[PDB]
């Protein structure tokens, strides 16, 4: 959206 990390479905959001 605006908004999110914009990563692909198999990614685990990073630190």
């Amino acid at each position: 959206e605006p908004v999110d990390p914009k990563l692909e479905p198999w990614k685990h959001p990073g630190s």
């Epitope: 914009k6 990563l7 692909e8 479905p9 198999w10 990614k11 685990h12 990073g14 630190s15």
Partner: antibody, heavy 117, light 113 residues
């Protein structure tokens, strides 16, 4: 300007090792996942490895899993690919790329690897 | 593992004319979150790949909007409304929905003369 500059390619024997790097500049390196891709002599493109912005998560397809290691130095804006147990099939032009916008946005210039005895 | 198939393999086009490239995946690229991670890129001879399209039809801001992407499911199309001489190169589609990322084999666009 996003800029990615790979180096370290060359001729290597089957079974041997090589370490590639990618010098990133023009952006906040630490914020982005990064990836390696390669282009074969037949102009096939293939995904090689990806690493999370922070460093903790690494992802590899079966073809390289167990042989290559992707790692990154957030302090020096540098991405690496440690290639072990090279195979003739690994012969390719290797590109560093930035993961963003639901995929990949910028590619580097490539560094060439030939695996041959 | 997701098979990506592009058609045609080569496409010969006159400058000013439209062109259309197709990309078909072996299974659906729509993910549960309602997004479809289907991408297009161009590699000009002797150059690095350049992003053209992401999430099916979102346009890279360096690319003129004579390029459009459309489709859903397993069927995708890149269209060029009017070809220019600098479009010469190999167009690839690729998917990031299913691990591992996979590429179509490329469509070579050549300029008619």
């Amino acid at each position: 300007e996003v800029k990615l500059v790979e180096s370290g390619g060359g001729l290597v024997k089957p079974g041997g090792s090589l370490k590639l790097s990618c010098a990133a500049s023009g952006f906040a390196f630490s914020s982005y996942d990064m990836s390696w891709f390669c282009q074969t002599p037949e102009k096939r493109l293939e995904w090689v490895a990806s690493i999370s912005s922070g460093g903790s998560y690494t992802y590899y397809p079966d073809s390289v899993k167990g042989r290559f290691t992707i790692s990154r130095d957030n302090a020096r804006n540098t991405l690496y690919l440690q290639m072990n147990s090279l195979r003739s099939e690994d012969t390719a032009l290797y590109y560093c790329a930035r993961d963003y916008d639901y995929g990949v946005d910028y590619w580097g210039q490539g560094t060439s690897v030939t695996v041959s005895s | 593992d997701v098979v990506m198939t592009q058609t045609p393999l080569t496409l010969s086009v006159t400058i000013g004319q439209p062109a259309s490239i197709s990309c078909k995946s072996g299974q659906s690229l729509l993910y549960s979150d309602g997004k479809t991670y289907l991408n297009w890129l161009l590699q000009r001879p002797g150059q690095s790949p350049k992003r053209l399209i992401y999430l099916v039809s979102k346009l890279d801001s360096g690319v003129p909007d004579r390029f459009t992407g459309s489709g859903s499911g397993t069927d995708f199309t890149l269209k060029i409304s009017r070809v220019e001489a600098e479009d010469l190169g190999i167009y690839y589609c690729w998917q990031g929905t299913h691990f591992p990322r996979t590429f179509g084999g490329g469509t070579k666009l050549e300029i008619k003369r």
